[PDB]
Design an enzyme around this catalytic site. Structure first.
Site, short mmCIF file in Angstrom:
data_model
loop_
_atom_site.label_atom_id
_atom_site.label_comp_id
_atom_site.label_asym_id
_atom_site.label_seq_id
_atom_site.Cartn_x
_atom_site.Cartn_y
_atom_site.Cartn_z
N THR C 1 0.86 -1.21 0.00
CA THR C 1 0.00 0.00 0.00
C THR C 1 0.88 1.24 0.00
O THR C 1 1.70 1.43 0.89
CB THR C 1 -0.94 0.03 1.22
OG1 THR C 1 -0.18 0.14 2.42
CG2 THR C 1 -1.78 -1.24 1.27
N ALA C 49 -7.26 -2.29 5.88
CA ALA C 49 -8.38 -1.97 5.01
C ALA C 49 -9.69 -1.97 5.77
O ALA C 49 -10.53 -1.07 5.60
CB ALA C 49 -8.45 -2.97 3.84
#
Lengths: 217, 238, 201, 242, 204, 233, 234, 243, 213
Positions: C1, C49
């Protein structure tokens, strides 16, 4: 209950045409000591169900009592219903599962057997809320010794007479009594047919030790 | 003096007025009729509109896949009892994996509507119910009062001018037990019709129908599925 | 990420990768990591997430109430302060959440970086995530306050491309957003294999 | 009264509490129920009125099971009857948990009187408009029959009646002997009393609801089989003509 | 512990018609000193001082929460506070928080207002009344100050001679401790007047 | 069962009275007469204890309850409401003794008891206590005498009466009281001023006398009171 | 005697609710017509001076980007229901990620609309019933809808409804002008014609509020020049 | 807990307790407000009730924040409860949102806070109305009036308290944009309106002004007296040069 | 001590076509090293256009299903409609998150049809969060099925081939294939394979035998 005290060991269950059979030692152990040498680990629950429980006997005395009160309170209304086995088996999953979220697990493994509406039902319940039906059940150590004999017989003749089942459970207690440390000579067979819930009393198990003369070193 | 200011005052005649007055709310409302055969329970309620612009208000509530009710009275109160029944029947499915027995569901409403009738400053729910239900003992109609009593019915009707509807149900009580489906619904319509003036009758905007059966979960027929059961009727006799 | 975001004279670029891992095993590489809060606030995911998707989305339900009761869009500065105060009650519970509220305001482009630990800083460049350290390098040698809108798209693609090329938990495809004062537009969504044949030769 | 009856919390200048006496009338407006204790069980008779052909016969009961070995027969506002029956059920389940046997009837009587009494002391509540009788058999205590009224008073009884014709039926029970008969003999005499005290000129019809609880059934409480109910109604129509 | 975390030392020493109470002044965070003037002795009505050594946070809360329970007792009743009570009032404010204690050891040093009889007592951090007639100490130089007092004390001293002894026994005790020093202050209460002298010491 | 009433039943009237506390006083002034004499040396509390027959017992109940080891009560008013205040006072005293390790001063124990009585003229659903207290005590080298009214105020006296014929007793004391009276001689003055209101012959069972000197509060045993009635010691 | 807030009249209906119904007959007038092309809500912003700022007394609100609401009666109570609905459509969108159907938001504010408890209730429950009538008029997946909601806590779908102080004279005049072929432009003029009769002020581009909700648009309230544009035709 | 219904509906469709609370306002001391285009002005009647008073406790013009002033009339006790709980609200909103409160927002909150007490158990509705004035973040003047009902409207000029019906009419005939052109001409419009209700003036007119982005300024009595002299120097030629 | 979780294996599989959505799974319910039972579907029909797979901790699989089926009934009572696919997916997330600090240990896969009539799949973490895929393997044999299957559907790392849409017959034969090869090398898969096909005609149920070893 993060540690059990006095536990029963193993509970066999098998389906046959017109009912189910449950088996269980009458023994309650406290460590290696076999401290209470005659207890009933199978209880009658109205006319079409019974429970066999291994694991902590003290949490069992407490279902034995709440499940009993939950049945009395059904028959007072008198409206004819009564709970299936398929109902008592759900209701227990929910109890374990909810005592698992609070972290006070009922340290039992349970076998609900029952016959209702021309249908056999064999239920298992874990102290985690694992739960399922199957033609064969065994709890604790029976999961590895008796389960392979019960299951071998049902993958080559998926029906059974009430007389082949009696024998299928007396052949599996003998194997349990040989290889399992916490087992006992005297054990109960419970049998639910359409005529009710019969609890055959202290049966013994004849053994043989032909192999005590073949070890020589 | 006066004994009508609270539900917590007996009267020198042994009657409690604030529970009698609740009963008037149920007769102020719209007429409804329910009956049972042996395999089918059927509710038909007379929806009523405010003007020619407004739409008709809904008198049949789906409760579960085997229950259904038809209200009559104050509707605010009628949805506090509907949400409390929906909650009993999503609670039993959750705990037992079975539908609630109809007779058992009426027991819970009997307790819960009794409490506010014995507690200062509260009031009884101004709504009478008709519960259509099908479980193991076949079909049932129950009738609940704001008195908190209830009755297991063979076929009932409450609301405005229901005296007339009950007359029709006490004249044909024998047929019901052995009707087919279409014939039962037609009986209930003839009974529901007698509640109106002879200056009008049932259309497709006045009636909704709720059937629960042996093989048929509770269903509601709105305004254009009422035509098959409304057709095949004769005209009301003069 | 690897997200990164910088303001310049025509607005705010927000650029992300798209990979998301179960640790060593790439679970899905189609994860949209830029969360359309409103039609005028972008956000980003960079912690867990689960944690961003939920708290993030909950900042939307807050900012839509605010916008109906007071009858005006909510500041960027203000939206960041809702999101610090929500998450600051769960300090120490183990939330992760490296979000970048980004929008346009009554004070021009606005960019804040909110943490789950309780930080709330306005800046001009940021990078959040596992490749964030690789982005700062290539982003800061090409960054100036004045650029063209075509310089900036090409700086951000490049600076995500370089993060996903060193790092291991970054990859997938490069989303790219550009917040103009009327609302954000979804610029591009170039894959990272494609970008590799445009930069090598 | 003027302020001497609005509240349950107001003694009258007499010494009487009109709100408790007013609850007594709600019992007088309800049909009759009689209880007769023989020497090996109890028998309950309820004069349930049939008011329409719209009600399912054998429903709208007034005979409950408070516990598997206890009957309750009620008279008065039914709503409160179904409220009392759940406080008992709750109490007698409670007792079986903490003490591990069936709750003795003498005791359950007191707990439910307690709970009825607590509703005659406050403004927040009104007394119960409901009288009832508890009946139970054991093989270690005998047949027992208690009866609780709105006041909260309980007494033992050999035979008891409550409802709109309590005067007439108490006399017809005193002619009857009971300390020597079995259940099988009494059940016919219960039905017989009910038919004599009921008016078919004040009521359309009536349905006779009968209950064992005694040596026949093994201490359990159960309604009377359909066969012995038809016989007890047939024996009551013949003794009524005579 | 977490009361060596700020050092501190308090000593109270009963004379003949007078009572002395001395502290050091070094407020530091373990090793790093922040300031050299930080009061560990508070007046509680005239002719009655309470000293608090130990964790600097509970020093200030106990001194502030004790002034709030003393002022409200000295108004609601008119009688000025008597030192034997003030002890039990403090024993009860520590024991109010038995589990999760305060990290201070009070040293109460006063004269009875109605008379003049001198009075000293310390307290364990959970609330114990330890009344002596020699001298009490609490702090982190506990062992050192006991040594010095047990050999310099004498049953009856005048108020000029008392001040020599508490001074001698506080300068030599605090010099042999790391986390204390930086000058000591000394109240010496007599019937008429309260003298407050600061001793020149090690700024080590 | 009720949560309780919340609204107050004491309430102002258009004139400015708290009608309920006005009536509580008239209950007091109907009670058994009682007198108090502080003797600049000790305090004496006397009250009449007449019964309706010979059937009662006199060693069952008393009107001179001790609160501490130097604080006594007497009362007139409602014997029930009196037994409540006695009990509350003893918990206050002990609560106080638990925190300061001294025995509660008497100035203190009058404000604390007063406030409880005050609190029942401003809480829900309750009426005021139909009592007045005489709270003697010997603290700090002196004696003390106070009197708590159903209102919730108090006054420090050197002599006073209350209950029946307290207008007659209060003027008998205003005349026949001389500061620096002896403690013994106060007892003669107490039983004396209690003799005007009283009706019938005095005996050792009819009056409860309780002293309060630096040795501590106590009841006088029936024997000592028989030698004060005679006056032969 | 005095009767609490939970008391049935021998008639059959609750005292307090009977009176909340009279509290509307003092309020403003609102006329919503519901067509096949959208819902239009018109109301009169009853001013009282020329000093009063006509632009800060609106009685049409956005509940969401597809559900307008126009209330008449005690506007002060309204601000508690409205706020609870906005919270309601949003909660709903937070869980299911779709819009709330206009029927279901009417239902959630109607539960709130009847529940007050002299005794035996929370400390934050309402002491009395709400003195409002509402006209939710959104567009969703069943096409345009309009709902009438009264202080009794009951709701009936409509086609064209007038609430407020001039309900009777407007309601009769609606039955003669409303037909199912009506378009959204014909409906807006039908509103202001009937509103112009029953206003004892005068029709003016600041004395009304006009807002629509259309299947193709969001909730859009008419500015001041788009009101002037439809007062030429009247 | 004291749970009771205090506000309940009249059978007539009214609401007695709020009709009555608006009687309490009507007994109060008049207050007026006009908004200029760069100045907003509160003026409250009666500051002289002795020569023994303190001039910091008789106030009826308070500050909630730097944007926002608030005058009131009615029960002075109730008002000091609302004023406070607003002040707290003004910071809570300066914390969570960075911009300071606008005047619409602090009112909406004072409104809703009066409305709560008109529909909760045990409570008696606040007995005040309010004039809230301020400048937004963008720099426009705003004037509001709250009611004990819990309703509010923006205004351009307004008056609450005894003799508000007289003053309202005065402000409809004297407020245009030829009055209100400069800052000093606005202050005079307020004083002409108060002098209609009070008997003396310049000695009962308490007056306070707030301008652009400066904070509240209470005008000492000499600034008010000067302006009341200007009204008497205008009353000469408004009738002698019209004749 | 006491573990509130245990692993129970089970694999689920979901391919979203453009006119169908397949949800597959094994039925073996293992615990530790014994095989509790051989017949326990991991697939539960919800509405007519929606299936959900649950694998992982059969204690929580079982609870979580009754919680979906009870707010799913709740929704049809308040809104008077059936609940769409994308609605459930968004709802399932808020349930999972509601227990963030003692989570459900469940891999979920919702397959069904959105409102264009085409296939839709949503995969979940145990802690919430979902995306929209065209195929997601879940559970114990998720790493056996992802690299192969996701080649054949997506055509990743292929070159010079035809990107033909998925036929209902080309997929079904794919599912049966990948499972036969994952039950050879993975120990938590076998006994039988239950496929659920979701087209607008209803929901068919197939069954194929796998390796009983």
């Amino acid at each position: 209950t993060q540690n059990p005290m006095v536990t029963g060991t193993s509970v066999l269950g098998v389906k046959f045409e017109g009912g189910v059979v449950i088996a269980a030692d009458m023994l309650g152990s406290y460590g290696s000591l076999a401290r209470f040498r005659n207890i009933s680990r199978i209880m009658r629950v109205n006319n079409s169900t019974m429970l066999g429980a291994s694991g902590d006997y003290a949490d069992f005395q407490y279902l034995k009592q709440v499940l009993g009160q939950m049945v009395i309170d059904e028959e007072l209304l008198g409206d004819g219903h009564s709970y299936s086995p398929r109902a008592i088996h759900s209701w227990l999953t929910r109890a374990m599962y909810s005592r698992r979220s609070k972290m006070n697990p009922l340290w039992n493994t349970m076998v609900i057997g029952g016959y209702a509406d021309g249908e056999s039902f064999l239920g298992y319940v874990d102290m985690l809320g694992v739960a399922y039906e199957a033609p064969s059940l065994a709890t604790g150590y029976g999961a590895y010794l008796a389960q392979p004999l019960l299951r071998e017989v049902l993958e080559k003749q998926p029906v059974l007479s009430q007389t082949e089942a009696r024998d299928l459970v007396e052949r599996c207690m003998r194997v349990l009594y040989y290889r399992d440390a916490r087992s006992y000579n005297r054990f109960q067979i419970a049998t639910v047919t359409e005529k009710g819930v019969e609890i055959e009393g202290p049966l013994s198990t004849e053994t043989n030790w032909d192999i005590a003369h073949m070890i020589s070193g | 003096n006066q004994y009508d200011n609270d539900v917590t005052v007996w009267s020198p005649q042994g009657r409690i007025h604030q529970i009698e007055y609740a009963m008037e709310a149920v007769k102020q409302g719209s007429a409804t009729v329910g009956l049972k055969s042996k395999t089918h329970a059927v509710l038909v309620a007379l929806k009523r509109a405010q003007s020619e612009l407004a739409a008709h208000q809904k008198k049949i509530l789906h409760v579960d896949n085997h229950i259904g009710i038809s209200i009559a009275g104050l509707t605010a109160d009628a949805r506090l009892l509907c949400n409390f029944m929906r909650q009993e029947c999503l609670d039993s499915r959750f705990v037992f994996d079975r539908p609630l027995p109809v007779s058992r569901l009426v027991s819970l409403i009997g307790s819960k509507t009794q409490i506010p009738t014995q507690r200062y400053g509260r009031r009884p729910y101004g709504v009478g119910l008709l519960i259509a239900g099908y479980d193991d003992m076949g079909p049932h109609i129950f009738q609940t009062c704001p008195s908190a009593n209830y009755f297991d019915c063979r076929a009932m009707s409450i609301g405005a001018r229901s005296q007339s509807a009950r007359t029709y149900l006490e004249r044909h009580m024998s047929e019901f037990m052995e009707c087919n489906l279409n014939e039962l619904v037609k009986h209930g319509l003839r009974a529901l019709r007698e509640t109106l003036p002879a200056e009008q009758d049932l259309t497709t905007k006045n009636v909704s129908i709720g059937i629960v059966g042996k093989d048929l979960e509770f269903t509601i027929y709105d305004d254009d599925d009422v035509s098959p059961f409304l057709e095949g009727l004769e005209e009301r006799p003069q | 990420t690897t997200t990164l975001a910088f303001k310049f004279r025509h607005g705010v670029i927000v650029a992300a990768d798209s990979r998301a891992t179960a640790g060593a095993y790439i679970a899905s590489q189609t994860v949209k990591k830029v969360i359309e809060i409103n039609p005028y606030l972008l956000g980003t995911m960079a912690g867990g997430a689960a944690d961003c998707s939920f708290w993030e989305r909950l900042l939307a339900r807050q900012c839509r109430i605010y916008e109906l009761r007071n009858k005006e869009r909510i500041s960027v500065a203000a939206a960041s302060k809702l999101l610090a105060n929500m998450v600051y009650q769960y300090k120490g519970m183990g939330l992760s959440m490296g979000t970048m509220i980004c929008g346009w305001d009554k004070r021009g482009p606005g960019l804040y970086y909110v943490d789950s630990e309780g930080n709330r800083i306005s800046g001009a460049t940021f990078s959040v995530g596992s490749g964030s350290v690789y982005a700062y390098g290539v982003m800061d040698r090409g960054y100036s306050y004045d650029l063209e809108v075509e310089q900036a798209y090409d700086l951000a693609r490049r600076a995500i491309y370089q993060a996903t090329y060193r790092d291991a938990y970054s990859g997938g495809a490069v989303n790219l957003y550009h917040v103009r004062e009327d609302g954000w537009i979804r610029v591009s969504s170039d894959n990272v294999a494609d970008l590799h044949e445009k930069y090598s030769g | 009264g003027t302020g001497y009856d609005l509240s349950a919390s107001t003694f009258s200048p007499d010494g009487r509490v009109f709100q408790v006496e007013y609850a007594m009338k709600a019992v007088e407006n309800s049909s009759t129920a009689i209880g007769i204790r023989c020497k090996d069980g109890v028998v309950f008779g309820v004069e349930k009125l049939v008011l329409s052909k719209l009600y399912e016969e054998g429903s709208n009961k007034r005979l409950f099971n408070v516990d598997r070995h206890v009957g309750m027969a009620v008279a008065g506002l039914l709503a409160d009857a179904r409220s009392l029956a759940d406080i008992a059920r709750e109490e007698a389940s409670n007792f079986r948990s903490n003490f591990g046997y069936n709750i003795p009837l003498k005791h359950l009587a007191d707990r439910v009187a307690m709970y009825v009494h607590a509703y005659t002391l406050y403004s927040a509540v009104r007394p119960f408009g409901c009288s009832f009788m508890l009946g139970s058999y054991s093989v270690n205590d005998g047949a027992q029959l208690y009866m609780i009224d709105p006041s909260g008073v309980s007494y033992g009884y050999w035979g008891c009646a409550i409802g709109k014709a309590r005067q007439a039926a108490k006399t017809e029970i005193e002619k009857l002997q009971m300390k020597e008969m079995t259940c099988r003999d009494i059940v016919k005499e219960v039905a017989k009393i009910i038919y004599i005290v009921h008016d078919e000129v004040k009521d359309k019809a009536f349905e006779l609801e009968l209950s064992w609880v005694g040596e026949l059934t093994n201490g359990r409480h159960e309604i009377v089989p359909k066969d012995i109910r038809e016989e007890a109604e047939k024996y009551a129509k013949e003794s009524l003509k005579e | 512990s977490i009361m060596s975390y700020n050092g501190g030392a308090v000593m109270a020493m009963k004379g003949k018609n007078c009572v002395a109470i001395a502290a050091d002044r070094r407020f530091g965070i373990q090793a790093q000193m922040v300031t050299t003037d930080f009061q560990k002795i508070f007046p509680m009505g005239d002719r009655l001082y309470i000293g608090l050594a130990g964790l600097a946070t509970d020093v200030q809360t106990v001194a502030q929460r004790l002034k709030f329970r003393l002022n409200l007792y000295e108004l609601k009743e008119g009688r000025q506070i008597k030192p034997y009570t003030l002890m039990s009032m403090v024993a009860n404010l520590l024991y109010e928080k038995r589990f999760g204690p305060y990290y201070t050891e009070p040293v109460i040093a006063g004269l009875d207002p109605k008379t003049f009889k001198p009075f000293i007592c310390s307290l364990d951090l959970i609330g114990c009344p330890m009344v002596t007639d020699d001298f009490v100490v609490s702090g982190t130089c506990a062992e050192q100050m006991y040594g010095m007092c047990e050999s310099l004390w004498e049953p009856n001293m005048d108020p000029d001679h008392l001040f020599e002894t508490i001074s001698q026994a506080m300068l030599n005790a605090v010099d042999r401790d790391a986390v204390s020093g930086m000058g000591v202050i000394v109240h010496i209460i007599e019937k008429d007047k309260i003298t407050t002298r600061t001793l020149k010491a090690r700024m080590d | 069962a009720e949560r309780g009433y919340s609204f107050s039943l004491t309430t102002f009237s258009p004139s400015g009275k708290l009608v309920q506390i006005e009536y509580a006083l008239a209950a007091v002034a109907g009670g058994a007469p009682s007198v108090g004499i502080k003797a600049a040396n000790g305090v004496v509390l006397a009250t009449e204890k007449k019964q309706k027959s010979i059937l009662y017992d006199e060693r069952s109940v008393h009107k001179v309850e001790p609160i501490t080891k130097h604080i006594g009560l007497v009362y007139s008013g409602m014997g029930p409401d009196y037994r409540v205040l006695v009990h509350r006072a003893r918990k206050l005293a002990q609560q106080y003794y638990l925190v300061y390790q001294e025995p509660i001063p008497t100035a203190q124990l009058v404000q604390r008891v007063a406030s409880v009585m005050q609190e029942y003229t401003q809480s829900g659903g309750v009426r005021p206590f139909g009592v007045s207290l005489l709270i003697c005590g010997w603290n700090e080298g002196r004696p003390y005498l106070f009197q708590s009214d159903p209102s919730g105020a108090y006054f420090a006296w050197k002599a006073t009466a209350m209950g029946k014929n307290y207008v007659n007793g209060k003027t008998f004391l205003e005349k026949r009281y001389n500061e620096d009276l002896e403690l013994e001689d106060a007892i003669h003055t107490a039983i004396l001023t209690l003799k005007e209101s009283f009706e019938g012959q005095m005996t050792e069972d009819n009056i409860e006398v309780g002293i309060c000197n630096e040795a501590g509060f106590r009841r006088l045993t029936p024997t000592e009171v028989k030698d004060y009635l005679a006056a032969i010691a | 005697y005095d009767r609490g807030v939970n008391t049935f009249s021998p008639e059959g209906r609750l005292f307090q609710v009977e009176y909340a119904i009279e509290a509307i007959k003092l309020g403003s007038t609102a006329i919503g017509i519901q067509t096949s092309e959208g819902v239009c809500l018109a109301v009169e912003k009853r001013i009282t001076s020329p000093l009063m700022e006509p632009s800060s007394i609106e009685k049409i609100v956005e509940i969401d980007a597809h559900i307008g609401c126009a209330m008449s009666g005690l506007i002060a109570d309204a601000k508690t229901l409205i706020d609870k609905a906005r919270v309601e459509t949003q909660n709903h969108w937070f869980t299911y990620n779709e819009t709330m159907t206009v029927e279901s938001v009417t239902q959630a504010v109607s539960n709130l609309a009847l529940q007050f408890g002299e005794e035996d209730a929370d400390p934050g429950a309402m002491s009395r019933p709400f003195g409002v009538a509402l006209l939710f008029g959104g567009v969703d997946e069943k096409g345009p809808q309009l709902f009438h909601m009264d202080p009794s806590g009951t709701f009936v779908q409509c086609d064209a409804r007038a609430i407020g102080s001039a309900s009777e004279g407007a309601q009769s005049s609606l039955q003669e002008v409303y037909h199912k072929s009506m378009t959204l432009k014909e409906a807006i003029k039908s509103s202001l014609i009937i509103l112009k009769q029953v206003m004892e002020e005068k029709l003016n581009a600041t004395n009304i509020e006009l807002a629509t909700v259309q299947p193709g648009q969001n909730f859009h309230m008419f500015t001041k020049e788009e009101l002037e544009e439809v007062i030429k035709d009247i | 807990s004291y749970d009771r219904a205090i506000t309940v509906f009249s059978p007539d469709g009214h609401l007695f307790q709020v009709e009555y609370a608006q009687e309490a306002v009507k007994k109060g001391s008049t207050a007026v407000g006009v908004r200029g285009r760069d100045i907003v002005v509160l003026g409250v009647e009666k500051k002289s009730v002795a020569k023994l008073q303190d001039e910091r406790t008789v106030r009826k013009i308070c500050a909630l924040d730097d944007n926002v002033c608030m005058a009131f009339a009615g029960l002075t006790a109730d008002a000091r409860i609302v004023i406070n709980r607003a002040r707290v609200e003004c910071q809570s909103h300066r914390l969570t949102v960075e911009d300071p409160v606008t005047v619409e927002y602090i009112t909406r909150y004072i409104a809703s806070l009066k409305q709560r007490y008109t529909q909760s158990n045990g409570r008696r509705p606040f007995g005040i109305s309010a004039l809230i004035v301020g400048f937004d973040f963008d720099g426009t003047p705003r004037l509001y009036q709250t009611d004990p009902s819990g309703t509010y409207h923006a205004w351009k000029a307004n008056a609450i308290g005894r003799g508000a019906k007289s003053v309202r009419e005065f402000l409809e005939k004297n407020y245009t944009d030829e009055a209100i052109e400069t800052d000093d001409l606005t202050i005079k419009l307020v004083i002409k309106a108060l002098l209609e209700v009070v008997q003396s003036g310049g000695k009962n007119i308490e007056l306070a002004v707030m301008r652009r982005d400066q904070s509240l300024k209470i005008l000492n009595p000499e600034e008010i007296e000067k302006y009341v002299a200007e009204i008497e120097k205008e009353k000469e030629e408004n009738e002698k040069k019209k004749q | 001590r006491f573990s509130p979780y245990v692993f129970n294996g089970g694999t689920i599989l979901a391919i979203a076509g453009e006119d169908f959505a397949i949800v597959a799974s094994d039925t073996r319910l293992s615990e530790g090293f014994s095989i509790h039972t051989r017949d326990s579907p991991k697939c539960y029909k919800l509405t007519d256009k929606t299936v959900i797979g649950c694998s992982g901790f059969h204690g929580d699989c079982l609870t979580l299903t009754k919680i979906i089926e009870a707010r799913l009934k709740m929704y049809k009572h308040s809104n008077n409609k059936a609940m769409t696919t994308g609605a459930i997916a968004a709802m399932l997330s808020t349930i999972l998150y509601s227990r963030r600090f003692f989570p459900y240990y469940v891999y979920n896969i919702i397959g069904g049809l959105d409102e264009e009539g085409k296939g839709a799949v949503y995969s979940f973490d145990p802690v919430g969060s979902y995306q929209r895929d065209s195929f997601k393997a879940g559970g114990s044999a998720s790493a056996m099925l992802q690299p192969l299957l996701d080649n054949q559907v997506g055509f990743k790392n292929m070159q010079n081939v035809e990107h033909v849409p998925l036929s209902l017959d080309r997929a079904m034969r794919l599912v049966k294939d990948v499972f036969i090869s994952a039950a050879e090398r993975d120990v938590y898969t076998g006994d039988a394979l239950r496929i659920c096909i979701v087209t607008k005609e209803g929901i068919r149920e197939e069954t194929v035998s796998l390796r009983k070893d």
